[PDB]
């Protein structure tokens, strides 16, 4: 029941909230200065919008996999490590980075 997290750095947070509310037919689950997120059931998705002041276009901020509990984060951390990937754990999260620099977190909310 895990789901992808897509975090986008957007030049215009307000415009982006409006667009994504239309695209996914639902409003944001959380709104803070410079930040919003959407919890989408179908397709299963955690969409995070981070305002990038002065940015000329939307870019990838980071990626992730949102899992149900801490045990699953721990399982993923061990599995990824034993596969030979360099990992950094928080505590609950584990981070890895792809060869072109894109960061992924496996995390529980």
Listed ranges 4-12, 35-43, 59-67, 82-90: which one lies at the site for Na ion (CB under 5 A)? 59-67
Instruction: Decide: is 55 part of the binding site for Na ion (CB under 5 A).
Output: no
SS3 of 62, please?
strand
Neighbours of 64 (CB within 10 A): 20
Give the residue among 45, 56, 54, 53 at the shortest CA–CA distance from 7: 45
Known binding residue 102? Answer is no
Contact by Cβ (8 Å): 101, 63: no
Known binding residue 72? Answer is no
Instruction: State residue 38 phi and psi, 5-degree precision.
Output: -120, 135
Q: What sign does the CA torsion over 86, 90, 94, 96 have?
A: negative
CA atoms within 13 A on the CB side of 1: 4
Listed ranges 4-12, 44-52, 56-64, 100-108: which one lies at the site for Na ion (CB under 5 A)? 56-64
Instruction: Decide: is 59 part of the binding site for Na ion (CB under 5 A).
Output: yes
Instruction: Decide: is 71 part of the binding site for Na ion (CB under 5 A).
Output: no
Known binding residue 61? Answer is yes
Instruction: Decide: is 60 part of the binding site for Na ion (CB under 5 A).
Output: yes
Q: Least distance to Na ion from the beta carbon of 39, Å?
A: 23
Known binding residue 62? Answer is yes
Annotated binding site for roxarsone (III): 61
- Return residues touching Na ion (CB under 5 A): 59-60
């Amino acid at each position: 029941m895990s789901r992808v997290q897509l975090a986008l750095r957007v030049p215009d947070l307000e415009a982006s909230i409006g667009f994504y509310s239309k695209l996914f037919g639902t409003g944001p689950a959380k709104v803070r200065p410079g930040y919003a997120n959407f919890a989408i059931a179908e397709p299963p998705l955690k969409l995070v919008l981070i305002e990038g002041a002065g940015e000329d276009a939307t870019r990838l901020d980071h990626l992730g996999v949102e899992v149900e509990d801490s045990a699953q984060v721990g399982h993923a951390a061990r599995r990824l490590k034993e596969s030979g990937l360099a990992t950094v754990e928080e505590n609950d999260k584990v981070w890895v980075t792809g060869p072109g620099g894109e960061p992924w977190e496996v995390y529980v909310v």
